[PDB]
Short mmCIF file of C-alpha atoms (C1' of nucleotides) in Angstrom, two decimals:
data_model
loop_
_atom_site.label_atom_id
_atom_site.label_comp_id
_atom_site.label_asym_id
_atom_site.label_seq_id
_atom_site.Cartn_x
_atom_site.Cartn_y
_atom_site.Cartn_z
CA UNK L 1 4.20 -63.41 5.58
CA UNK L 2 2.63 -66.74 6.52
CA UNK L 3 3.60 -70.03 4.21
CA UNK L 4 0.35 -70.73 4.20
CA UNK L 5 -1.80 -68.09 4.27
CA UNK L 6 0.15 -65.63 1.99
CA UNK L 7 -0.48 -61.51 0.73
CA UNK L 8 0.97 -59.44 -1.17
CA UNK L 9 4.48 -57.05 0.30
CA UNK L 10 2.91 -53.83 -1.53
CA UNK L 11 0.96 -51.98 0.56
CA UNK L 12 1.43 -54.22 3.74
CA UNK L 13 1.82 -51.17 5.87
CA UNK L 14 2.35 -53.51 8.79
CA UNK L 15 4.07 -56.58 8.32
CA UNK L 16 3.53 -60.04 10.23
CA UNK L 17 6.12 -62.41 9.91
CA UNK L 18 7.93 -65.30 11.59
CA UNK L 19 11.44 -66.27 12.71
CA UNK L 20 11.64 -69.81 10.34
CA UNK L 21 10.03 -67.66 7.36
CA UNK L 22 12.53 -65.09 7.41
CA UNK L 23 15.33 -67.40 8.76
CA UNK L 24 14.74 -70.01 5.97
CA UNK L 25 18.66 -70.24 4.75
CA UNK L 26 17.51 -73.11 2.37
CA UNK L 27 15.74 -71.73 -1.21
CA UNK L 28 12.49 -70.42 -0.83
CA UNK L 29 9.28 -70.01 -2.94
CA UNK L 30 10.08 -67.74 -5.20
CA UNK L 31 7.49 -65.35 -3.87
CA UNK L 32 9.07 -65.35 -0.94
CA UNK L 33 12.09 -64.42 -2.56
CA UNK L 34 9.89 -61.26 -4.12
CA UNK L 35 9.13 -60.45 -0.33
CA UNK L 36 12.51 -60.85 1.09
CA UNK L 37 13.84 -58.03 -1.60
CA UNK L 38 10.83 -55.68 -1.26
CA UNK L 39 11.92 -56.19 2.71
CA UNK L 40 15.00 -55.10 2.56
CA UNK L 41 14.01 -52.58 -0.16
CA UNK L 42 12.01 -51.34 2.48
CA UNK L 43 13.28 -49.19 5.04
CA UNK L 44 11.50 -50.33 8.29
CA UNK L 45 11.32 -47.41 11.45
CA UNK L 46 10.11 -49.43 14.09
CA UNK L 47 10.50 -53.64 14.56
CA UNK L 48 8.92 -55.73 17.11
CA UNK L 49 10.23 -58.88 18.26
CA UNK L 50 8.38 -61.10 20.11
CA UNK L 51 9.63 -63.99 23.01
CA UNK L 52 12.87 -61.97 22.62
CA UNK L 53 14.40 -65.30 24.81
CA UNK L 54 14.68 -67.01 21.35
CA UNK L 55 17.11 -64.40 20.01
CA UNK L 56 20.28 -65.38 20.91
CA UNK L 57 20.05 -68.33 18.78
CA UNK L 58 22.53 -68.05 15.21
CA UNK L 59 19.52 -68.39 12.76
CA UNK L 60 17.51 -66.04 14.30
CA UNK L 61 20.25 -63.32 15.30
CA UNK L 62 20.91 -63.49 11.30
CA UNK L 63 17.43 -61.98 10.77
CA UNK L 64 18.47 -58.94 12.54
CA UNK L 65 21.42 -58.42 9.83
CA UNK L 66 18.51 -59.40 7.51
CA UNK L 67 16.27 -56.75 8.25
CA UNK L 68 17.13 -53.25 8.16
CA UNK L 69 15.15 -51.47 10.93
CA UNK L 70 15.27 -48.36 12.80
CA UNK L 71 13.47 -49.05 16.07
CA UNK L 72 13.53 -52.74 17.21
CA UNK L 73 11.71 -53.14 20.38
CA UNK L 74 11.42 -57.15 21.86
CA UNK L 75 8.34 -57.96 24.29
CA UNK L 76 8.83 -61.06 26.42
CA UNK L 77 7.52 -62.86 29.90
CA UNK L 78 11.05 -64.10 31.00
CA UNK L 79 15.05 -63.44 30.31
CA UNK L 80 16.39 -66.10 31.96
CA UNK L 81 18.43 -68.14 28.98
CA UNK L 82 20.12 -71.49 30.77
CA UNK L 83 22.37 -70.56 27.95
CA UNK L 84 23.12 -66.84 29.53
CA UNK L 85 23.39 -65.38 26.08
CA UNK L 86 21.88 -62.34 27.39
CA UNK L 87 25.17 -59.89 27.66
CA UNK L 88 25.20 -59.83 24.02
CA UNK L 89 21.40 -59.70 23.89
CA UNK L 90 21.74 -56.27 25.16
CA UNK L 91 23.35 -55.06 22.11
CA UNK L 92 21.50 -56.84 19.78
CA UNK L 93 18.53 -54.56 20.92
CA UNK L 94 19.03 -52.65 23.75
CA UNK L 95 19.09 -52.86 27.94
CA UNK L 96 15.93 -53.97 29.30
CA UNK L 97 13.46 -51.09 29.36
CA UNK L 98 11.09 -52.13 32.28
CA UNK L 99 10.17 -54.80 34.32
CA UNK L 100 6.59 -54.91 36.11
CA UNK L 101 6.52 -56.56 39.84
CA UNK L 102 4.43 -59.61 39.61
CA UNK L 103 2.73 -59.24 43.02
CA UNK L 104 2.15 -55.29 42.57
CA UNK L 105 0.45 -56.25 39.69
CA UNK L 106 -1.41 -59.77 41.67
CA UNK L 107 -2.15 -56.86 44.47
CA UNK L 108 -3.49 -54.57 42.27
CA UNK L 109 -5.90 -57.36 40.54
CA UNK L 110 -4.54 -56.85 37.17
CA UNK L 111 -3.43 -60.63 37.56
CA UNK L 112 -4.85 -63.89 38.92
CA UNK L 113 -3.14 -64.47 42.34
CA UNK L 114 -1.47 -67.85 41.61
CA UNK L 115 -1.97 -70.64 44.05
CA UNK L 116 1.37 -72.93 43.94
CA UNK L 117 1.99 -76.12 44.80
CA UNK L 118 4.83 -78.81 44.90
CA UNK L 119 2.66 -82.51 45.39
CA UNK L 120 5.25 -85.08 46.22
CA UNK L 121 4.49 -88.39 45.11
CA UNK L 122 6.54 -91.25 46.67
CA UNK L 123 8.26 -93.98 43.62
CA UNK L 124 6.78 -97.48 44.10
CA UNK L 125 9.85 -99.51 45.30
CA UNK L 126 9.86 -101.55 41.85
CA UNK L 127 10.16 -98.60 40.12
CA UNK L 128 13.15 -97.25 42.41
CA UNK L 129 14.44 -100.05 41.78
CA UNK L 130 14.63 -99.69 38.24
CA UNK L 131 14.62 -96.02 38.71
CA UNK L 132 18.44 -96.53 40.39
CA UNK L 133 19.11 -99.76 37.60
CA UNK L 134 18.83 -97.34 35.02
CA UNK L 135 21.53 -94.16 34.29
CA UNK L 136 20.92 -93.33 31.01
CA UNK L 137 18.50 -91.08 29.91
CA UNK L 138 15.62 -93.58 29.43
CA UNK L 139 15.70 -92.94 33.57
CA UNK L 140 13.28 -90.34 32.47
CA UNK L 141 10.24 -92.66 31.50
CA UNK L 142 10.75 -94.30 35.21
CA UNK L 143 9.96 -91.45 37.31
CA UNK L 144 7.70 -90.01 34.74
CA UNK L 145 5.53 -92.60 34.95
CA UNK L 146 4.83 -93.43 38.48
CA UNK L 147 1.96 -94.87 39.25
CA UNK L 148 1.94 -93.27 42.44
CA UNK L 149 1.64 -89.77 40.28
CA UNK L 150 -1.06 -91.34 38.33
CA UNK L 151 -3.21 -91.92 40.82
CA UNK L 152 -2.72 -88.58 42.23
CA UNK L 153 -3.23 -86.88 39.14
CA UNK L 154 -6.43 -88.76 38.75
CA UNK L 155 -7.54 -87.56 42.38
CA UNK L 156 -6.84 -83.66 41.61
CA UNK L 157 -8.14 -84.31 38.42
CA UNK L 158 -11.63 -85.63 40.34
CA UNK L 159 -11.14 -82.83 42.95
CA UNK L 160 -11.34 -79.96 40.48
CA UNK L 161 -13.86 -81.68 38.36
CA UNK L 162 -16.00 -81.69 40.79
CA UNK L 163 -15.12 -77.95 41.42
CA UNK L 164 -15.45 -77.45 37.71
CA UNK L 165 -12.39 -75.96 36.85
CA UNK L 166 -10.55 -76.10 33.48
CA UNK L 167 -7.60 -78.83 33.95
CA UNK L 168 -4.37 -78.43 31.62
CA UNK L 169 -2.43 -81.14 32.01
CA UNK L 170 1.53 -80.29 31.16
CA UNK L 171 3.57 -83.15 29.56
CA UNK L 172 6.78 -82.75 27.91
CA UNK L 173 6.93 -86.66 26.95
CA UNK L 174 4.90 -87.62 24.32
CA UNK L 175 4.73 -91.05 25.04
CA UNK L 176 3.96 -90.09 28.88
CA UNK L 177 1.19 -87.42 27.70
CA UNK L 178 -0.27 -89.87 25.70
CA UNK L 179 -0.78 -92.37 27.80
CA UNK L 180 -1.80 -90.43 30.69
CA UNK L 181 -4.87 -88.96 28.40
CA UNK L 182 -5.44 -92.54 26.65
CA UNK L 183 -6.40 -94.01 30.36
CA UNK L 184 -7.63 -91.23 31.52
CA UNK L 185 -9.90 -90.38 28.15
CA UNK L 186 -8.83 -87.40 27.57
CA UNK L 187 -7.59 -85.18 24.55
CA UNK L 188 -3.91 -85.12 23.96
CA UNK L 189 -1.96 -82.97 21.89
CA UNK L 190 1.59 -84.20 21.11
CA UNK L 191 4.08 -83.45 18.29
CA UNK L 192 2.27 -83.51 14.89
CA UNK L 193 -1.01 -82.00 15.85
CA UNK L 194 -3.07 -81.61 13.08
CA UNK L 195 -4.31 -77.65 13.31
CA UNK L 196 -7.85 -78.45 12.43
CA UNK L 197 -8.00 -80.90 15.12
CA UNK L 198 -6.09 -78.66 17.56
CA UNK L 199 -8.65 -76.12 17.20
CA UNK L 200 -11.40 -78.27 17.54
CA UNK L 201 -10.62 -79.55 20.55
CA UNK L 202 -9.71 -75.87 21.99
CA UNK L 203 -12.65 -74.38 20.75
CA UNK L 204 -14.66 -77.61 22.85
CA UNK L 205 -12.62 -77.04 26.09
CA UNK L 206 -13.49 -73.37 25.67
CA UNK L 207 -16.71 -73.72 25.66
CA UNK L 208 -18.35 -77.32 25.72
CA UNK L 209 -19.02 -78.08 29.58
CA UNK L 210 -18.23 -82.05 29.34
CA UNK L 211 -14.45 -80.80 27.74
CA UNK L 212 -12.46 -79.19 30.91
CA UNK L 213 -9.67 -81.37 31.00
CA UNK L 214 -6.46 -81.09 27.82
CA UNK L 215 -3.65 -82.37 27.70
CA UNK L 216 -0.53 -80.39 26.17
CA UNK L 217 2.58 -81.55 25.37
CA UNK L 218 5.99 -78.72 25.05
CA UNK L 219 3.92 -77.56 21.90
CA UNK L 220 1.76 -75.65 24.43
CA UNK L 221 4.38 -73.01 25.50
CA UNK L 222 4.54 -70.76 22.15
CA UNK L 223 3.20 -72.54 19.04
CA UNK L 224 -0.61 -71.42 20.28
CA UNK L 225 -2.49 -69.64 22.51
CA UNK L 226 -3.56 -71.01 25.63
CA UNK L 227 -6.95 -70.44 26.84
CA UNK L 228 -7.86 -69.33 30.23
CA UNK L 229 -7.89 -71.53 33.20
CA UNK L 230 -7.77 -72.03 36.74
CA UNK L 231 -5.78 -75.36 37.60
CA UNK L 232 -2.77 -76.18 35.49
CA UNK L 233 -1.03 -79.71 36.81
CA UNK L 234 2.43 -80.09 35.14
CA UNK L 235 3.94 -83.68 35.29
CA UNK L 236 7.03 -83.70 33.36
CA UNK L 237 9.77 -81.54 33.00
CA UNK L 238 12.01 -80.35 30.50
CA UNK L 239 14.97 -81.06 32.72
CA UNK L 240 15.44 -77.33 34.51
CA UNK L 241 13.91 -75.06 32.05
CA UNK L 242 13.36 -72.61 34.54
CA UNK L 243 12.56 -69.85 31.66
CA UNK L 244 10.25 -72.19 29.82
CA UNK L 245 7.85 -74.03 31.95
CA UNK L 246 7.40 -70.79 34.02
CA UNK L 247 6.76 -68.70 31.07
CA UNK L 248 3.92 -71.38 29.84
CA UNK L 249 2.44 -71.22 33.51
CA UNK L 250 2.54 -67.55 33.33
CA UNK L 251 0.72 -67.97 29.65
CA UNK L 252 -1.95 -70.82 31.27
CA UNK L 253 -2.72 -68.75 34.36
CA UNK L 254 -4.81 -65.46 33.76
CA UNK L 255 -7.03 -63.04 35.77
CA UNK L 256 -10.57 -64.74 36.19
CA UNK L 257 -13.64 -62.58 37.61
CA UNK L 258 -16.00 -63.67 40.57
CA UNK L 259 -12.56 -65.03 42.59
CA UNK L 260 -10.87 -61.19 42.53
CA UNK L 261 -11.47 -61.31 46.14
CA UNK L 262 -9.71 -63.93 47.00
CA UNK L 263 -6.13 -64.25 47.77
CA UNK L 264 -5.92 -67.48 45.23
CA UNK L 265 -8.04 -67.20 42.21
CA UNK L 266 -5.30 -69.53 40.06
CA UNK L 267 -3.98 -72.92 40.84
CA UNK L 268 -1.10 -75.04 39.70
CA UNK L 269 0.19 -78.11 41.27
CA UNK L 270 3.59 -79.76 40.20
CA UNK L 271 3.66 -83.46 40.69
CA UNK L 272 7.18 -84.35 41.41
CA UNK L 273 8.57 -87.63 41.83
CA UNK L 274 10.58 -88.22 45.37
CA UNK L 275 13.59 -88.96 45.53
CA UNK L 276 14.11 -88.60 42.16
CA UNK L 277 16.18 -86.46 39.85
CA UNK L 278 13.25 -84.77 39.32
CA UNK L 279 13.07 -82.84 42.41
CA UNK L 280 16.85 -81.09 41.91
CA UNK L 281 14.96 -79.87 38.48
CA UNK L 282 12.26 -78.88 40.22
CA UNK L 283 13.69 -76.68 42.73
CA UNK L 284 16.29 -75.67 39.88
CA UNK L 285 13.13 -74.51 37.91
CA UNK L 286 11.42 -73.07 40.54
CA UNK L 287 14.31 -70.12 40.98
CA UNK L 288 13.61 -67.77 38.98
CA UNK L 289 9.41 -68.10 40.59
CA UNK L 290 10.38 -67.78 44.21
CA UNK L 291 13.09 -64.72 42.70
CA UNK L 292 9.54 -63.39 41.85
CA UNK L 293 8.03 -63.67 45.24
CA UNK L 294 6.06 -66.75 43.74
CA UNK L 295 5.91 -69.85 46.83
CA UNK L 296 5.72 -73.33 46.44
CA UNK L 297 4.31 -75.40 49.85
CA UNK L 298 5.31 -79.04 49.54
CA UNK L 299 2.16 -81.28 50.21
CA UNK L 300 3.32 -84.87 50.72
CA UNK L 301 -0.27 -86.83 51.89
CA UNK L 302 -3.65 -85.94 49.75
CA UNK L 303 -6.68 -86.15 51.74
CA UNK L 304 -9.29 -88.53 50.02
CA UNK L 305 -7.51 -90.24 47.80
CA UNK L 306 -8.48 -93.14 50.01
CA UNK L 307 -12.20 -93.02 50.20
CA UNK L 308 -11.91 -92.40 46.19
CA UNK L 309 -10.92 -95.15 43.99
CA UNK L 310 -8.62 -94.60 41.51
CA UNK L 311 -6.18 -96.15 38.85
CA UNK L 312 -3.74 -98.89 39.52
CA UNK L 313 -5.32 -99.51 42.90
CA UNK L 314 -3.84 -103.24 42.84
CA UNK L 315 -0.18 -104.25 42.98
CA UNK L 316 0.15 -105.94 39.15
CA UNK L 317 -1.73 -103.11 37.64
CA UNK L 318 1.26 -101.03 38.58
CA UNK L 319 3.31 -103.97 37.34
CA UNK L 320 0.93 -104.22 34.20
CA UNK L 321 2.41 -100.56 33.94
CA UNK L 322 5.80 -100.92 34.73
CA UNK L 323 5.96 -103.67 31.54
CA UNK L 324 4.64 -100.91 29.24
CA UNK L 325 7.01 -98.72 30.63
CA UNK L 326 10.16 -100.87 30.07
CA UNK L 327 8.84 -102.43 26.45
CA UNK L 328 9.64 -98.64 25.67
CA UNK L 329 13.65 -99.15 25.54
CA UNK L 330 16.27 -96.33 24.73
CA UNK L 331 14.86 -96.25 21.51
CA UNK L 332 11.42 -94.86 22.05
CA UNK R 1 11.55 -88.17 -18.49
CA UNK R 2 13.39 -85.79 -16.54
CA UNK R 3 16.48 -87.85 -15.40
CA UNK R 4 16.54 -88.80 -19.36
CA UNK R 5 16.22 -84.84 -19.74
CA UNK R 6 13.65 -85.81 -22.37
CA UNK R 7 10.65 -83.35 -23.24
CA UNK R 8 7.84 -84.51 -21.40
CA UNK R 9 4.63 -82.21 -21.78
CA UNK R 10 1.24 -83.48 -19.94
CA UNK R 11 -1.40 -84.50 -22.37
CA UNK R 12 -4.70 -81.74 -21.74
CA UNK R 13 -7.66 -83.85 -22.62
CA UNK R 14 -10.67 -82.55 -20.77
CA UNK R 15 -11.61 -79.92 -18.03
CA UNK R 16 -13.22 -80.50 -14.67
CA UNK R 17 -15.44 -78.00 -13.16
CA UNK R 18 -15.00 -80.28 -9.65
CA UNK R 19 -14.34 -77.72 -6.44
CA UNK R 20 -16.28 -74.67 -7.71
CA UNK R 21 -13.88 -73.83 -10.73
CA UNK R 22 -13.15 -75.79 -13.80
CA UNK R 23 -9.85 -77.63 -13.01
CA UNK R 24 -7.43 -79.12 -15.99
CA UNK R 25 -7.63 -82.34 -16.88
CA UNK R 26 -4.90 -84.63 -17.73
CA UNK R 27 -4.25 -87.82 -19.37
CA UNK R 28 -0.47 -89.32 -19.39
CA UNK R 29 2.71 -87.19 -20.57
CA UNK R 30 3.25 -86.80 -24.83
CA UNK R 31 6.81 -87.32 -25.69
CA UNK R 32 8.05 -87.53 -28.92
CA UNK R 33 8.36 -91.00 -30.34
CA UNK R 34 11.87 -91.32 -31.05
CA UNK R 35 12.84 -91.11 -27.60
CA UNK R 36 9.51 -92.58 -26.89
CA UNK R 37 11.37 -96.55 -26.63
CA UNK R 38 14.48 -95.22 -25.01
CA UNK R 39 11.95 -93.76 -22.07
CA UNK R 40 9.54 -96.72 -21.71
CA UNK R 41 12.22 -99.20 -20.87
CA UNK R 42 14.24 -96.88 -18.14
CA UNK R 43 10.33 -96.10 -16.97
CA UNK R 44 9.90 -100.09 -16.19
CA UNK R 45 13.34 -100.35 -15.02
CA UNK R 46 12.72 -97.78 -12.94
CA UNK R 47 9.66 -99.24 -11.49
CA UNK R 48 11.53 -102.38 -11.40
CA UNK R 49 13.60 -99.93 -8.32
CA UNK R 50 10.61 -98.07 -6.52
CA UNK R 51 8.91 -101.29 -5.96
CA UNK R 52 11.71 -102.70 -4.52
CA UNK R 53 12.48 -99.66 -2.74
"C1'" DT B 1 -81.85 -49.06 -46.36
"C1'" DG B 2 -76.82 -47.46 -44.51
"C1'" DG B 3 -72.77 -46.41 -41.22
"C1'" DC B 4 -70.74 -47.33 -36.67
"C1'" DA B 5 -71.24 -48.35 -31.04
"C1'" DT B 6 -70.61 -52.57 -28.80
"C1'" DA B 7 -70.70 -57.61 -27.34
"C1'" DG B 8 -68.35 -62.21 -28.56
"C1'" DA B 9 -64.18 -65.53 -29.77
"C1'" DT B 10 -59.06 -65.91 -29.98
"C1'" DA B 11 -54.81 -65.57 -29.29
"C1'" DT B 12 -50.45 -63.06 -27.92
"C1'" DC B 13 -46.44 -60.99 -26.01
"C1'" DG B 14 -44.22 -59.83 -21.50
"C1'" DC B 15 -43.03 -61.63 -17.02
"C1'" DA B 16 -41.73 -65.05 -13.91
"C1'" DC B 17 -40.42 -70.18 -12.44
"C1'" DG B 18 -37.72 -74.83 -12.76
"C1'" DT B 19 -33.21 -76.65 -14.33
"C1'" DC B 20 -28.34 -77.40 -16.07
"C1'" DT B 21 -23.26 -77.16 -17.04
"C1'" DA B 22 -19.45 -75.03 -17.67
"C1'" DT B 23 -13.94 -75.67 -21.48
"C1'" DT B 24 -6.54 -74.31 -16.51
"C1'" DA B 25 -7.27 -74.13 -8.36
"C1'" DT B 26 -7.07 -75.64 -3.42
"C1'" DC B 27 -5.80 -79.10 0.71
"C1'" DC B 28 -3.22 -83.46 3.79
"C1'" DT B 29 1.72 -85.46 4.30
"C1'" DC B 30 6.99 -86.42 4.20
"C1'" DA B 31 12.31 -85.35 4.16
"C1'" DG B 32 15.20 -81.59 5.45
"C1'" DC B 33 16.48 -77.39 8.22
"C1'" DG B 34 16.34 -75.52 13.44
"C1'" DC B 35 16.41 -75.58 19.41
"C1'" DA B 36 17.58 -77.47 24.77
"C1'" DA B 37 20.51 -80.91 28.94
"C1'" DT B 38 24.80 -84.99 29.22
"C1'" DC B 39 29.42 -86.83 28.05
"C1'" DA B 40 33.89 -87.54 25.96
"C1'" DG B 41 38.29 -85.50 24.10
"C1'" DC B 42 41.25 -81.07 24.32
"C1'" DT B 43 43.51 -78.46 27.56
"C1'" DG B 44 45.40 -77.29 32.03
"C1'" DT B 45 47.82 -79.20 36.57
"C1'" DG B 46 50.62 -82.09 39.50
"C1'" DA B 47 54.24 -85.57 39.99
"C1'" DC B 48 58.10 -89.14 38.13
"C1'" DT B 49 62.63 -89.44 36.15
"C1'" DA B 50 66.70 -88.91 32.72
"C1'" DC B 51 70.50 -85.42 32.16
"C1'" DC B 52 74.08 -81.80 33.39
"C1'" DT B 53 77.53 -79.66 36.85
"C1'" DA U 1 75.54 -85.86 45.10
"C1'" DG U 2 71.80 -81.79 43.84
"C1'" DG U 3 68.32 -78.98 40.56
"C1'" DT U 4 65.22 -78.18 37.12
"C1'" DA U 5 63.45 -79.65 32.49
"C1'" DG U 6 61.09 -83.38 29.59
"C1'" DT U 7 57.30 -86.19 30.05
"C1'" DC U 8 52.98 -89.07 31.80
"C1'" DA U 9 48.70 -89.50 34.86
"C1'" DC U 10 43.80 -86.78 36.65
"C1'" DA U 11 40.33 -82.34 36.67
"C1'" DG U 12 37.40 -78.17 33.93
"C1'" DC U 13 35.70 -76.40 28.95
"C1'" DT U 14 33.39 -77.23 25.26
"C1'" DG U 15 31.68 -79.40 20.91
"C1'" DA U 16 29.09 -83.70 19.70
"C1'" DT U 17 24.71 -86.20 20.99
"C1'" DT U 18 19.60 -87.34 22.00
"C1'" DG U 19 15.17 -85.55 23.07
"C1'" DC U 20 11.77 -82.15 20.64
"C1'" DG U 21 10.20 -78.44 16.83
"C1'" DC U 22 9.16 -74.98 11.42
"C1'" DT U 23 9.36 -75.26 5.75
"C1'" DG U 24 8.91 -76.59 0.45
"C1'" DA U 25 7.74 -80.17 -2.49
"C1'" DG U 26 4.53 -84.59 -3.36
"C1'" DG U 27 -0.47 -86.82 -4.14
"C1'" DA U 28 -5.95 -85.85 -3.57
"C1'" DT U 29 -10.24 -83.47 -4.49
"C1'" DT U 30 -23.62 -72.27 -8.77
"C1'" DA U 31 -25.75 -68.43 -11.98
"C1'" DG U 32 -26.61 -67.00 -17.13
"C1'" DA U 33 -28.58 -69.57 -20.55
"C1'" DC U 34 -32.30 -72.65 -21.69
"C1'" DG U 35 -36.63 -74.36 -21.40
"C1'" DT U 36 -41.55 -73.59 -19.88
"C1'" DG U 37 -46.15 -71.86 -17.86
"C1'" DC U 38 -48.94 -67.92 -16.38
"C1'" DG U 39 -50.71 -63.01 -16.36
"C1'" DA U 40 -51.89 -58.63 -18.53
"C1'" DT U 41 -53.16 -57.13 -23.27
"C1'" DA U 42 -55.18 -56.32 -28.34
"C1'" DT U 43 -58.05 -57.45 -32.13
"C1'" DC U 44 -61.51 -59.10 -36.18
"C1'" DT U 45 -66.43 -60.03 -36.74
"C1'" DA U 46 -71.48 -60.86 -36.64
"C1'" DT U 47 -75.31 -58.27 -35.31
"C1'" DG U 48 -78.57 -54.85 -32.93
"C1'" DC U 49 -79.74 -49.69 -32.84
"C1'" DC U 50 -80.83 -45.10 -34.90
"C1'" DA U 51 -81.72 -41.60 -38.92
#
DNA sequence: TGGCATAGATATCGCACGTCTATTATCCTCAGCGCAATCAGCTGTGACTACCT
DNA sequence: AGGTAGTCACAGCTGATTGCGCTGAGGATTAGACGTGCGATATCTATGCCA
């Protein structure tokens, strides 16, 4: 029950639907309407739910009234609402069932052992500056865009190049995302995100050898699959969405063969901004993952980032940046 | 025609096989004439807006 | 001399090859509905002061 | 002169706000029949042969 790709209610012995399509409160196509009554016409035994987090929000709690179901079982990575609507979650389905123990499961190989970092990457003075100048939330773009963490991200990205890993590159700022990937010429994916050219540019990282490095904006935690790699580099942050960015590293992050052996198989690095805001979100977000025996080390000085060179290696290039940085007011 | 609630049906004049099927072709809306003067001149008029706009 | 087997000239219908036009559906893009972290006004708390005995 | 109630000046709670996302309504966009050439197929006729 797709708005796009569309079939028939009679005979759909198993139905596939979405939140939005069932939760659209403004009029509908008028097949839709046609589906909605042979739904509740239909008297459904079992329900499944997916990313059961979502739930607790009004517009998708009224598709439970909606639907008349016996069975309604929800499937999710995390629980952890920053709203805590999850008391009344447990009678809008039913007390969590099970749980599985992330490093019984790491142990037992069914999961890539992650390999966690926390990269610290000191704010050019300027910047700080700025950075303190500034308390609004356009504060954001000035620790989001240090050049500091550019040319560290540019180093790991070389590093693991060179090892030939896949690279996903996690921005929540559009603007930041896209600049990163326009310097660094690299794909970007970002709010609108035509699906043809979404696809395309999976299906290239997948398999093309000279593709191993996306970058995803929030779009990349739910609205698609991910597919499998080993290094996953996050650079901006929601803001302590603890639930969220961990479920999309859980999502990134999957078991790989010919590294079983080895204690870390996966990596992910979080480039966090000293002295920053950033770093109370960080270790905010980073709760619930050390709550699941998950460890960050803190790495403050990358080795050969000196003998490489990189991006804004001179002082007005970092200036050069800190101008594009500020023409972007409140606005953008 | 349709803020003027005025019958406006879409003049059929050929067929286009273009795509793989033939596809309906259509040439300008017939509406009968006595409204026909009463519709042109809102129609310019509102032009006259959109352009603007 | 007379009737009929057999070689010659002539097409002839069935089978396949090259080519065209039909006479009514599908695919990008925008305005309008949602979800997640700050910040101000409502509400609660502590202290100043007029009024009664 | 003494006590407690009416009333005005600072902290938490919570809805409004600023960053991002799905929909429904817009403009845009090739094989049976027909014609034609080839391949397998009959057919009329002049004449030689035999009784």
């Amino acid at each position: 029950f797709t708005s796009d790709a569309k079939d028939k209610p009679i005979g759909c012995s198993v139905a596939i639907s979405t939140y939005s399509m069932l939760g659209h409160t403004t009029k509908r196509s008028w097949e839709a309407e046609r589906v909605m009554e042979w739904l509740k016409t239909q008297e459904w035994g079992l329900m499944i739910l997916d990313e059961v987090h979502t739930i607790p929000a009004k517009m998708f709690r009224r598709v439970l009234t909606i639907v008349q179901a016996h069975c309604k079982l929800g499937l999710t990575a995390t629980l952890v609402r920053e709203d805590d609507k999850i008391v009344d979650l447990n009678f809008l389905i039913g007390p969590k069932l099970y749980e599985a123990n992330w490093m019984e499961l790491q142990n037992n190989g069914y999961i890539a052992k992650v390999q966690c970092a926390e990269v610290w990457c000191p704010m050019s003075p300027e910047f700080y500056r700025e950075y303190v100048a500034i308390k609004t939330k356009k504060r954001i773009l000035l620790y989001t865009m240090n050049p500091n963490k550019f040319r560290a991200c540019q180093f790991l990205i070389k590093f693991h190049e060179r090892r030939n890993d896949k690279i996903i590159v996690f921005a929540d700022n559009v603007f930041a995302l896209k600049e990163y990937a326009i310097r660094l010429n690299k794909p970007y994916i970002y709010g609108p995100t035509s699906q043809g050219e979404r696809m395309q540019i999976l299906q290239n990282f997948k398999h093309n050898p000279k593709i191993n490095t996306i970058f995803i904006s929030k779009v990349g935690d739910t609205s698609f699959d991910l597919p499998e790699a080993n290094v996953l580099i996050q650079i901006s942050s929601h803001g302590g969405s603890r639930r969220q960015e961990a479920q999309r590293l859980g999502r990134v992050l999957r078991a790989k063969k010919g590294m079983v052996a080895e204690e870390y198989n996966a990596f992910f690095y979080s480039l966090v901004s000293q002295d920053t805001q950033e770093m109370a979100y960080s270790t905010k977000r980073q709760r619930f993952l050390v709550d699941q025996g998950y460890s960050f080390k803190v790495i403050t000085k990358l080795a050969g980032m000196e003998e490489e060179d990189l991006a804004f290696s001179t002082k007005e290039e970092q200036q050069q940046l800190l101008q594009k940085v500020l023409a972007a007011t409140d606005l953008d | 025609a349709r803020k003027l609630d005025i019958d406006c049906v879409q003049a059929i004049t050929g067929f286009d096989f273009h795509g793989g099927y033939s596809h309906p072709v259509t040439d300008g809306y017939i509406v009968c004439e006595e409204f026909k003067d009463v519709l042109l001149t809102a129609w310019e008029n509102e032009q006259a807006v959109i352009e603007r706009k």
